[PDB]
Amino acid sequence: NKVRTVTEIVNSDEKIQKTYELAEFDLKNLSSLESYETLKIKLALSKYMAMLSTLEMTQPLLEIFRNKADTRQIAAVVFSTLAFIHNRFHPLVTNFTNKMEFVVTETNDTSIPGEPILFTENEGVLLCSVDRPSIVKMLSREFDTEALVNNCNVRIAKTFGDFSITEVEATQYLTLLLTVEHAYLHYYIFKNYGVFEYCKSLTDHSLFTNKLRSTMSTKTSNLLLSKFKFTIEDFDKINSNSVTSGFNIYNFNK
């Protein structure tokens, strides 16, 4: 549907006319609905769960990662998550990198503090590192499942008028999805800008904004971690140890 507007000035009978197409306003309104974005995120998570299900991966993720002996399931789960994220970024390639190897880490002695899934080149083939105890500690941590994070009127008006997926399981799925999303961002910088840039990014995540917004911000969908604005409680007080009398002329990351 189209809406027409007419402007008339008091010096003549001239009328200048413009046509507005309502679809743009409808799209903005739909993008402003909380239920719409919630449905988008939940549909992404549901597609992830369905993708795991068709790969027999019905067992809870914590149970999958708790099995030390069976490495094939862990490798398949991580590879499938990487492929799902890759398809989300590029909705044209259904198969991930056709050949890559997996190594599972069970020791702190060879563990990376903060990047549980890491990628490296052995001069012959891609290799992916999986820190199994880190993922186990992530998924096994007790979750806050009774607290409320900030409509009562619609509830009042209403009052006057089969796979068993618990909340813990869904939170575990989302946790693994976000972790593999971080790993995939690192891997994307790797594959597209070299090992040097990948190891530069491992120590400074601020290069993501420059090496993603050039291509991803205008071609792919929205990232899962962008659904909410995350901040550290009392960040300024803790950061007060490292304060600079700064002069920022290349503040490329607000």
């Binding site: 402007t7 200048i16 402003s32």
Partner: protein, 218 residues
Amino acid sequence: ELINMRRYRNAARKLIHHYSLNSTTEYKISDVVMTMIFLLRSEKYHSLFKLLETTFDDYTCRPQMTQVQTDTLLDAVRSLLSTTIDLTTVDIMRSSFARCFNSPIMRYAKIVLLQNVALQRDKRTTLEELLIERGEKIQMLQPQQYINSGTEIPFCDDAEFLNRLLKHIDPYPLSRMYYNAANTMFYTTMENYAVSNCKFNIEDYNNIFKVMENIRKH
């Protein structure tokens, strides 16, 4: 032996002397735990321990103390400190301990979630309810004071500048300028209405600009 009795005892003496009398130095949480441990472990201070523990929440009480009980509490607390005291000292120390036990302790940092975009709910809202809600939200904001240099209305009577601006904007049609201004106003209004999930009343927006005919007819 699990309890270093004497060091606990002096810690409790110091803390209770500070809270009861010196209501005006500083102590750590460890000393508070120490004082409570001493009060619990010492047999003759059980009544005082219960009285101070009643300050943990607002749904705890104490049975009415008979006379001999209040004298026992009093000389026990005096043995804690020779200075003469009474039940009022017990009351002020209890209030100080109540303030202390409600003091928050250290906690690790947590990731706090902030709403990215003020996403509206499914049900459409009219202009009036939206106005009420947004006015309530604005009420919570902190206004800023603006002080003008003087009371006189700003103006300019420089002829040369006035005819010069007029000449510069002379080749600029009024029709196109007014059309652009009205259309950008309308587009911004409609965009805000769509984002706010508010119903747009076309008749009201049309009634906005009827001063044209009001002037022309009268």
